[PDB]
UniProtKB/Swiss-Prot annotation, chain A:
It comes from Homo sapiens (Human). It comes from the Eukaryota. The chain holds residues 100 to 148 of 1676 of the full protein. This is Complement C5 beta chain.
From Swiss-Prot, chain B:
Residues 1-52 form the TSP type-1 domain. Belongs to the complement C6/C7/C8/C9 family. It comes from Homo sapiens (Human). This is Complement component C6. Component of the membrane attack complex (MAC), a multiprotein complex activated by the complement cascade, which inserts into a target cell membrane and forms a pore, leading to target cell membrane rupture and cell lysis. The MAC is initiated by proteolytic cleavage of C5 into complement C5b in response to the classical, alternative, lectin and GZMK complement pathways. The complement pathways consist in a cascade of proteins that leads to phagocytosis and breakdown of pathogens and signaling that strengthens the adaptive immune system. Glycans are attached at W8. It comes from the Eukaryota. It is linked to Complement component 6 deficiency: A rare defect of the complement classical pathway associated with susceptibility to severe recurrent infections, predominantly by Neisseria gonorrhoeae or Neisseria meningitidis.
Amino acid sequence: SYVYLEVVSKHFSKSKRMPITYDNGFLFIHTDKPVYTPDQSVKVRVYSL
Amino acid sequence: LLGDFGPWSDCDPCIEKQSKVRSVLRPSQFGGQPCTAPLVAFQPCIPSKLCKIEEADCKNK
């Protein structure tokens, strides 16, 4: 759930307790069209960033 | 007769030095040499959390 930022320097130091997430990026689901009849093939692909 | 010191303790009171303690094995008696060689000694330190008061349930308060 957590990690620690730190500063080490000649002149000074300190430290922080900071949370951590696994939410990273963007998934864009690109279906070929938004309406189908049964026994159609749904084309689909993704753009991930 | 004193004891060796304990392991160095965190620091985080809002007074930031480190706690370390020793306690008396045998006390001075019948005029023998008494103790004043400090019972608890502390030295400088770093704040891993900045001082605040602690609880849970602050949702509705």
